[model samples]
Target: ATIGRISTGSKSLDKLLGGGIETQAITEVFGEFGSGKTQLAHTLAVMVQLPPEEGGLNGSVMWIDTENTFRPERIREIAQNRGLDPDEVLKHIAYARAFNSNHQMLLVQQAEDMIKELLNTDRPVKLLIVDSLTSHFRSEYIGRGALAERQQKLAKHLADLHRLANLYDIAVFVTNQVILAHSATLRVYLRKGKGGKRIARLIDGEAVFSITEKGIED
Candidate 1:
């Protein structure tokens, strides 16, 4: 089922992932606040902008900017270090800001429209990042009275993401601030390791990489 994979800019991390992030499937990562989870997105934000020959998807990306974590400044620095036009890389990383849980759900529909428009172009959308996907649901659905409704809506949200991935053969990268739930298929973990390292755990093995000004380092 490993027909396609997009690199994450870290050679060692890719080796830990059996090539790279799998296309047409949901690869969810979770850890604490300073675990370098979002840094992983920054790496992919730059990497997915290049052609596959350069360890990319030869396409653009659609990032769901939940938690106000879409950092263009860091992205620019990473792109520059990789010898790419910083602005050009930023140009390819499409961003969507979600304010509420319901708004976050609708964002995917809008994303479907944008992806459809660009799917056939040279910069076809290849990745979708839901940074801390569970945050809105967690905060909005507080009391036990709303727990049932929350899980239902969350399932629908993930279902749509899965549908989009399958239809477009794109990679869906979801980061969870807490281990709530999902049918996201393959799950990985990014934990904070000693000596400023980020540990990525796959199904069987694990890898250690660090985030730097250039993004994820091998």
Candidate 2:
């Protein structure tokens, strides 16, 4: 049976992203620094714990933090404000750190191993979050000399995500950073270079966020 769309817990953004994140698909979110990408990732960690009727998975989330930015306290506060038991809510999440791009992909592969362990214990991960896919790419792929190599690696990473998403039938949430450029008017799309194109083409689709004091609105 079709699981349909995955919920974001934010009514506005959900509406913008086709009712919610697609359950059997990979959704990528990209924006500039302080653009609320990581905040939204944290929000998803909590939301995944809520019941499905409340636009949640009622399941745990596997959060892959590549940039050292998963905040448990922030998520706890949001859960409490939403009338959820903060402590119980936080328990449903798992966090991991990826030192580099290769490490990031390796952890993602290892997710299956973790899943099998969880299954043996009768708990399963329903959501996956990769916060900031661009950092490693930017650091590793520099200058025209190394451009082609970077793009190839990036493309492979995206392919791996797709396979993992389908194999687990879970929602994959990834965040990327955009490079602001002037092409007549200000433009913020994928970063310039082969890696950018490879990644932009690999992810199923992307969500753009603009940060305000209130929260990640649009």
Candidate 3:
């Protein structure tokens, strides 16, 4: 069965993923600093609002920023570069900053509220993004002794994301500081490449690209 997919705002990356990021599944993107993790999140926020012909769902986005890295400026840039209305694009994105791990998890619940509200509207919610998914857990839970507890909580978190994706048939895109106990339906690893380029490799293919001020470039 071919599931619906959303573009990542990069043709190369989308082709490597057999079309684009799949809906009703969690797509995990992880890499080191300056690896374009958050940039892709912002790009997706814009792409999700586009019409289906342009690889979008024609829907709104919910972005849960845990690391204080969500930038409206960058989003606006991408929106305009695509000839979209910046203000309207910003209006479609629901942004939240999570202060801690517990607070982060709770924000998902709050998102559920927002999701319900949007679903009743013309443009339904189609994507949920959590930047740096494991930041708080890595800091608060330390050493081997706390590993199990951290893993347990992380399990619940992933379960909730999984349920949200499946139940609503939305694409759940998350960024991770590191690959840890839990996993996602699709995993892409990013790394610095030669020159101004980065490498994004999927389960079975690879893409080399660069992040321009406008957006991601092949």
Error of 2 at 182 (Å): 21
Model 3, 65-102: lDDT tens per residue? 88889989898999999889999999999999989999
Predicted structure 1: lDDT: 0.86
Q: CA lDDT, every prediction?
A: 0.86, 0.66, 0.86
Please report, as a residue range, the 10-residue window in candidate 1 with the lowest summed lDDT.
Answer: 177-186
TM-score on alpha carbons, each prediction: 0.94, 0.79, 0.95
Candidate 2 Cα errors over 4 Å, as ranges: 119-123, 179-218
Residue lDDT tens for model 2, 9-71: 555567656677765666776656655567677777777777778777666788888788888
Candidate 2: worst-modelled 10 consecutive residues by lDDT = 179-188
State the lDDT of candidate 1 residue by residue for 48-133, as single tens digits: 87777888888788999778988999989999999999998899888988998889999998899989999899998889999978
Candidate with top TM-score is 3
Q: Rank the candidates by TM-score, best first.
A: 3, 1, 2
Runs in model 1 deviating more than 4 A are 179-181
Q: Judged by lDDT relative to the true structure, which candidate is superior, 1 or 2? A: 1
Report the poorest 10 consecutive residues by lDDT, candidate 3.
176-185
